[PDB]
Amino acid sequence: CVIFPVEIDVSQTIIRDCQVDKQTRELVYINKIMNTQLTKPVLMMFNISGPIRSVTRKNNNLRDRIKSKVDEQFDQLERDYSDQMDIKYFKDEHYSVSCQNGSVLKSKFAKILKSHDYTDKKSIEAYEKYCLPKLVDERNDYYVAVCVLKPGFENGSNQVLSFEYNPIGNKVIVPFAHEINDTGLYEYDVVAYVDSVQFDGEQFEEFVQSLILPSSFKNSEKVLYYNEASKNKSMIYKALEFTTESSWGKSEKYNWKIFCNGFIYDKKSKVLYVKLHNVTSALNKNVILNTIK
Amino acid sequence: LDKVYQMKSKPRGYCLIINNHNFAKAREKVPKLHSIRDRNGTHLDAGALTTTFEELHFEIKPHHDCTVEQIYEILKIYQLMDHSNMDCFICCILSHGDKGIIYGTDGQEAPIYELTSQFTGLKCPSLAGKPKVFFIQACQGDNYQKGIPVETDTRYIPDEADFLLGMATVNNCVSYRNPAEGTWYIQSLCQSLRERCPRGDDILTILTEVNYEVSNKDDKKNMGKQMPQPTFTLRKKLVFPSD
């Protein structure tokens, strides 16, 4: 049964944020860029609820271990009938992470002792207009993690990064935010797994609702929206459904339900399963949650 | 003048349908087979072949999820039996596979040769001279068949005679099974059999059409194409009538 799948194509984004102890959570982040042979210093940033107390590299076996635990949680919704078969640096050689107090990054930004210099203004200039303005706000807190994946990062496995940090105020900021673009629309391709956070349908209805799903190329396709509240569950997601006919005998129909995207919450476990696979939305924001107070 | 296999016997013959569904034991033991899923839908073809070979007066004999070892025994049984009052013997295997093999619930292969040779003229004197049919729905490789554009449409007999062997696919290529409706081959083998049997057409005529259907069936996804391919050492037209 085929061994020719997943390769230089598999690179959406995987994020896992778990509470490791009383006041320390751990962030695991794997993006497309980290999985390619960089030839120059690459820059990337996001938001963290608190300050980073340590940055390390993990084994790629993690990328699938996470994406599984989640993809499965959503797959229980679907009904796919497709044919099957039989001031706080953290230097290192390859990378270089820096964690500053949101607002501080704006005021000094230019300072690239993190060595994203040779990109000069013609390259940094970009990030202050399309990214930076979306990482700092009226809540001058919201620390910004700044990484500079320097070449060599590809060598060996362990492309996954892990941020150990101390949440401030009981807040958790799952980094979905993008790079403000001229067009006005953003395409999401990410799976996240955060735990020890309290539900919040208000912000999940707002997100899921503004999602434009991919097409199955069938006039009869309708995109329904859901808001179930099972036993130990609560799902807010949009799926695409269309009925299908038999391929031989009896006139038995088959009601599909695919491309499900949204948020699933385990009332008991206190875990948040997120899935935004190739969906478009005019909403480009991070998701803020509260740690079980 | 002519020739045709006898099929008068009221209880035509047995129909060991071996339907494999759960390959969990395999997902654990055999390492390579850990990223393997279960054959969801097989039930539609087991309940398809059972219906078909029922109107054709065949005394079906279903078998759960069996492992290689059990399978060998299951065959070693209907081999020591007497098949005189029977004018036909059928055997259907449904499960995963690869290069001329058919995995079992366990995860270890089981060469087709060692399964179909179990019913030679020698091994089963009772079945000598009577057609022994085999339908094998299973992968046979990891490769996908491309699809080119047609732009149309008293004595002694050999020990391995009378043998129809329907292969869900050519060698080296994959077979297709659909969770909602069923597998292409098994389904066509029935929708075409259960229909052409009234009008009295031999199985060899039926399998031709079947290769037609599955050839059109297309894997909308990975541009896939299936292509059955039977083999026979039969001596006379095989045909079974009903009511």
From Swiss-Prot, chain A:
Family membership noted in the UniProt record: Belongs to the protease inhibitor I50 (p35) family.
GO terms (BP aspect): negative regulation of apoptotic process; symbiont-mediated suppression of host apoptosis; symbiont-mediated suppression of host RNAi-mediated antiviral immune response
Protein's organism: Autographa californica nuclear polyhedrosis virus
Listed InterPro entries: Baculovirus_p35, Baculovirus_p35_sf
UniProt function note: Functions as an inhibitor of the host RNA interference antiviral response. Inhibits the insect host cell apoptotic response initiated by the viral infection. Blocks as well the activity of members of the caspase family of proteases. Required for late and very late gene expression.
Gene Ontology molecular function: any one: cysteine-type endopeptidase inhibitor activity involved in apoptotic process
Pfam families: P35
SUPFAM superfamilies: Baculovirus p35 protein
UniProt entry keywords in alphabetical sequence: Apoptosis, Early protein, Host-virus interaction, Inhibition of host caspases by virus, Inhibition of host innate immune response by virus, Modulation of host cell apoptosis by virus, Protease inhibitor, Suppressor of RNA silencing, Thiol protease inhibitor, Viral immunoevasion
Domain of life: Viruses
Name of the protein in its database record: Early 35 kDa protein
Swiss-Prot record, chain B:
Main location (coarse class): cytoplasm
EC number annotated for this UniProt entry: 3.4.22.61
Subcellular location: Cytoplasm; Nucleus; Cell projection, Lamellipodium
Residue positions where N6-acetyllysine is found in the record: K3
Modification sites for Phosphotyrosine: Y113
Catalytic activity of the protein: Strict requirement for Asp at position P1 and has a preferred cleavage sequence of (Leu/Asp/Val)-Glu-Thr-Asp-|-(Gly/Ser/Ala)
Modulation of this protein's activity: CASP8 activity is restricted by RIPK1. Inhibited by the effector protein NleF that is produced by pathogenic E.coli; this inhibits apoptosis.
Function statement: Thiol protease that plays a key role in programmed cell death by acting as a molecular switch for apoptosis, necroptosis and pyroptosis, and is required to prevent tissue damage during embryonic development and adulthood. Initiator protease that induces extrinsic apoptosis by mediating cleavage and activation of effector caspases responsible for FAS/CD95-mediated and TNFRSF1A-induced cell death. Cleaves and activates effector caspases CASP3, CASP4, CASP6, CASP7, CASP9 and CASP10. Binding to the adapter molecule FADD recruits it to either receptor FAS/TNFRSF6 or TNFRSF1A.
Disease: Caspase-8 deficiency: Disorder resembling autoimmune lymphoproliferative syndrome (ALPS). It is characterized by lymphadenopathy, splenomegaly, and defective CD95-induced apoptosis of peripheral blood lymphocytes (PBLs). It leads to defects in activation of T-lymphocytes, B-lymphocytes, and natural killer cells leading to immunodeficiency characterized by recurrent sinopulmonary and herpes simplex virus infections and poor responses to immunization.
Full protein name: Caspase-8
